[PDB]
């Protein structure tokens, strides 16, 4: 409605100083984003000044015990592209009332790694490639799926233009701008090989914020698909039959690698990655993660292995 | 039709100083909000400066006895998020032409309680959690209700995002901004365990204003569902079959609780509520009733009642 | 389309000084409003400065004989809420080319009454309640009419809120603002007992202007229902079968009633009305109703 | 809905100095436009300052062997009419990682021709007429195709107006303004003989920028048909059966032609064109057409 | 489908002597008919030669789950107008495995009354008028219910003809013939005052068979509405709002009356023309023949 | 469409003496019925006089090996209710070209059991109850599934009548008459607890023919749902969520159990069944039995106890069981097996 969108787009700065904060977290599947919103007395840019919150963990498959309460710790702030003004998104990680990180909290361990002085001094930069597929809500097939099936790896959809080739660009372009506005370092987008299939890239992002941003980007994307009435999947294999997906390739570089200087340093890091069990060379790419893996794990494991691990 | 919203959204400040006041009241079922609007000469911020009004109680199940007139007393003003500008919402309570509160007027007795020096000195604060369900107008099942029916208490709807999980968010978000604009102390919202089910929280709100705000929040919400062509229910059990609803839990604290040695005041307060007969511990929580009644009963039982 | 509304909403002040004037009149059924629009060189606020106009009365059931021409006399100006800017609505009344009021022109005799020095001195104020029903275009039953039919006098529609109770509020709220914008003294609105049934109140309005304003308000409402694709009826009994309508009560006060003490003036006025602050009088033409009240209490001699 | 277009239409200048660049290239069929977008730190007006990029050529039928990587060289900048603000469109041509132009890269050779001192000194101007057909997505027949088939070369569609004659004008007018905004020298448009068939002209455009501009205009057009949910064809024969198409006629003038003009210089150019087989030369790649005329008339010696 | 109706209309007499018997009973609400079918070796006309059967009473609100078996006693036979041929309908009443009538079995007590020598010798005849309403499956409003709603008691529907007046006559005429074919003494039909509203009359019917026949006729009617995709209600008030229903009038005569009425009318008042038909019919006999003031 | 059904319903006896035989078999999932049809020179009543046939086993998940040919052995004849006249249905079991039964051929071992003199002398009768669900083709939810979802175990659908209660009776009544016409010993039908859920019973049928008849009855049902444009499921849980399904309960009696003294014989058989329980469950939790307590593994029934003779019910098999396995295992355990 036009009456409805007017209420949704009300600018609160004209009526008070209160802001709305959307607290966001990863649910019990490790892939389900959850959120809810609260009012704060005034604008906030420092996450550490945000109050902690809580939710019912037995409703998100995260607290089975007699105590269902789970605590939310604010960790990163972004501008809310939906509520606009001084309203914000808050990426949180999740803990028991006693202060223990939940098993589905991957940020905790990642934060320990990125806070290590020898990792922190190396200024690790990350570039993440996030593929996704837009799906018809009723049928669960990708937008533009051709009547008659699987089209193949050589087709008109990859970076295509036109009503018969690019399906869902409105969602994609809305997302690109929403992310820039929010403060995410989104570095690009492209239409992928399958109809309704797309990719966005994020980076360079330093350390723990790479994970914060990617989760923030996924949140915004699904909020946008929600508006459009379309289902989004980050699964590498979102439908049966043949399917061409990429994965979740991660580009990585340190202060030493970027100061050449250490062209050689890139190669030894690659040596270390091979030693642990895909990797190509500036910076280098890691080709093992799939499109739904947790970025906190992926990014921190690369730093640990290349900066802290000794066989 | 774009021609229509242009008219609805006209800025009257450009043409004169007159304002429109939407007078709101609780009807004969104790849960049905009613309203109508009048033009006033200029901007008003003090409810005591508003004229009294009236309506036909025989049309809202509030006047049987040969005299159908019921009187409206303005009690609280909020900004009107629908008409915008200087136009206002007016929460009223209802009286006979003779000056007596109607049986369905719960504000009067609640106000008497909050006006008592022993209550007023304790500065009672209230926090209310209002759960509600958004229902398809034609089928009366919740928005997004799954074909197989009751999904269970463990699902993707609670605080969910995405077309297949969150149903009716445009309404929820419209309501959130609308209340803040209106001047209600809405403190947050969340998607609940069932599809189409949500919650908003209001507070802390002082004394009689908790009820004023709650009714105002309910009014705004149902005005918004009206626009969206959706039905709203505040019933804990809004459909047959299995259902997970919470209720309307109420948080309460006094000045004594908020200061030094609240621990004792809190347990004692709980003891008296128990002695009268659902209560758990900052402050404490008390588990479709009228908020004027609920909030004032808590103050009275804990501050005025002497066993 | 959005291309269309852009053209409809052009601000003519940006391109010239010309304004558009919508001349409005009551047709041969006594309840059908008609209008058409003309271009004038510049802004006008004084009705007496508007040129007279004309139309084919044989197309509106208002001229049977060999000369079908009917003359329009501008009588009242309001701002046009549809064209916006300096464009205006013009309430006219209607005459033969020779200068005689048509039988369906009720403003003429009303004007004589309000022009009478004894009436004019009393500054009569009117408050008029206009009930109306919004009807589905195809079925001609009210918006929100329930499958089972007539619901009874006790229901959720009266001053109701919600998708299942208030039917047509967008029209009603558009009208309220449109009337205020136009310069009509609209004093309030409410949902009525039947679904799709509503009321607006106008006043206080002075003398002959009560009728001019009520007619302008009816005009504006029906232009709005036209936009919404809904039919409107001002008939107290707009559908067959059982139905609750209120009516059209008219509140009335003279200068004398409004001063000290007035109660006595009110007493006598009430007696004369029966025989033939303020007080209330229990599809009619507002020109007739209001002027008859003034005449009965100020000019008539029992 | 309206929420979606708000996000798409966000002005990024309010949040940072970063811009979005849409890299565009010709795919493996020689007629398929492809593109994707990346974030840059600040505004750029010089193509030579833009970073090179890459894509998977095995996905656009442009790299078969074990190395599917293809390099994009930015060549021309236009403002992005879709993202607005300081966002840009970037016309690119394509190379192997080793630095060799791909077979489907026609810009490379044209650029050698226009950079040649004997060509460059003559400032070749080009005027290109681009015909196209708007097709129903589901049926693949032109918009407004009549129940009964091919209407003939004599009809109401050529430069027509009205719902029954002009099909897809909203696309055409969006494109016209979009191209002007972008910085393309679009010189006019017209409805053509077949329903849903139209033409745009570009020029005068100097040298290599003629081809850059036509490709950018084709890109903008298909992005617009995409928004409209309509298919576009630049094929001279976009459906079976009889059909009236023009082609891609190219106008050409040299500095000397614009001087005296003399006409003799024109005669000479025409003569040389004949020998190999301003003035007019009657879906091909504009880089090829434009550069061959320049080569033949300025470099080629009989 | 013609392929489907060909299978449904197969004449089993052409392939064997086996027949199908549809056992019918009254469920736990007292108004819900239930049935299921079994194969028998050959034609049967004597209800007492039919085997008893059983069902899960916990699925029809007539037994608890821990002890759910309920026994079906065959009581009356009719020809089955749906399966045709030698196939039959069997009206049953219902008992615990120990042999007691279920509380929702009203036939048992009615049978005792009609078996009483003071009643049986008097040959009580019954005429029953059964009103019903045909309802649109999706809306639950009557067939032909007018857009503007409740029309009033004076209208064109009563005994009407035409597309705009008679709604559901196909169902009604099918029912009339089906009942006659089945062996029910259906004595007439008429369109009623409300749209989609109808009545059939059964009688004269002797004693306990009046109840058997009415239930059999109700069965046949709802099987027919099932075919037509229409819902049936025997409720006097089948929709909210105003409605014109008759009631449940019952005609009654004894052997003595047919040869008198006033003494019976007197007896009825303290407690000619006057819910479960077994109850209604037997209580009238009891009132006028067995009762003690 | 009447033009089409006229062709389908042609009486071939008026045009020739040739008949059409629909050879039917169980495919590689153990539940997928397959069939195809051939022309034979004249009418046939003796299955042993029908020629063998073959099919491509790599197309029904029944021959992975390099030789995809699988052989069809005719075993049972029924009249074809679809083609009518002298046209027939032929229940087959399936073998390698070399002559060995396929792993998915369960008839073979069952036949070996029913041919044993100790089983045959005993004349085992079987009664099988086949529950099934009719599903809307597009949504995969049952016919008549209510807008608000799962209704519960106490409702109006069980043996119900009316447009709002009984869903799919045309299919059910067509199937009942088609089976009778075909020569199958179908003994009854009823509407079940869930919307669109129904049951039919077959029996008493002696020995190996019980399985032949059950499979023929299943074939006919799915051929009828195909005509109706409806999907049929014999799965114990044809939809997610709560669901009330029974299974495929099997009644069993020997000549001795049916005569006087029979109850003592029944108890001994039940004892033997209990000693095996795990073997039977694995093929078809804690073994139990009684007369009217659910969910006993085995039920005797009031009538049997009362009379001192009759039969007993094995309530363990699920609705998608292979009747050859169930029927023959009951005979084997109670008549041939030595603990």
Author numbering:
A (entry chain G): 1 to 277, 314 to 317, 327 to 356
B (entry chain F): 1 to 277, 314 to 317, 327 to 332, 337 to 356
C (entry chain J): 1 to 276, 327 to 332, 337 to 356
D (entry chain H): 1 to 277, 328 to 332, 337 to 356
E (entry chain E): 1 to 259, 265 to 276, 329 to 331, 338 to 356
F (entry chain A): 1 to 284, 302 to 356
Question: Can you list sentences taken from the study reporting this PDB entry?
Answer:
The three-dimensional structure of M. truncatula GSII-1a was determined at 2.35 Å resolution by X-ray crystallography using synchrotron radiation. The crystallographic model revealed a decameric arrangement of the enzyme with D5 symmetry, with two stacked (face-to-face) pentameric rings. The ten MtGSII-1a monomers adopt very similar conformations, as highlighted by the r.m.s.d. of 0.35–0.65 Å for 291–311 aligned Cα atoms. The extensive contacts established between the subunits that compose each ring result in a buried inter-monomer surface of approximately 3500 Å2. The overall buried inter-ring surface amounts to ∼2500 Å2, i.e. approximately 500 Å2 per individual monomer–monomer interaction, highlighting the weakness of the inter-ring contacts. Considering the contacting monomers A and F from opposed rings, hydrophobic interactions exist between the side chain of Trp141A and both Ile147F and Gly148F, as well as between Gly148A and the side chain of Trp141F. In this particular case, the structure of the apo form of the enzyme was determined and therefore there are no ligands present in any of the ten active centres. In all of the MtGSII-1a monomers a segment comprising the Thr293–Ala299 region, homologous to the Glu-binding loop of bacterial glutamine synthetases, is disordered, leaving open the entrance to the glutamate-binding site at the narrower end of the active-site cavity. Despite the remarkable structural similarity between MtGSII-1a (r.m.s.d. of 0.98–1.03 Å for 320–322 aligned Cα atoms) and its closest structurally characterized homologue, ZmGSII-1a, there are some critical differences between the two enzymes. There is also a concerted movement of several segments of MtGSII-1a, notably the ∼180° rotation of Ala246, with its side chain now protruding into the glutamate-binding pocket, and the ∼90° rotation of the upstream Trp243 side chain that packs against Pro248 and leads to a rearrangement of the Lys237–Asp242 segment.
The first step of nitrogen assimilation in higher plants, the energy-driven incorporation of ammonia into glutamate, is catalyzed by glutamine synthetase. Glutamine synthetase (GS; EC 6.3.1.2) is a vital enzyme in the nitrogen metabolism of all living systems. Consistent with the diversity of metabolic roles, GS exists in plants as a number of isoenzymes, located both in the cytosol (GSII-1) and in the plastids (GSII-2), that are encoded by a small gene family. MtGSII-1a is expressed in the vascular bundles of all plant organs and is highly up­regulated in the nodules, accounting for the production of over 90% of the total nodule GS activity.
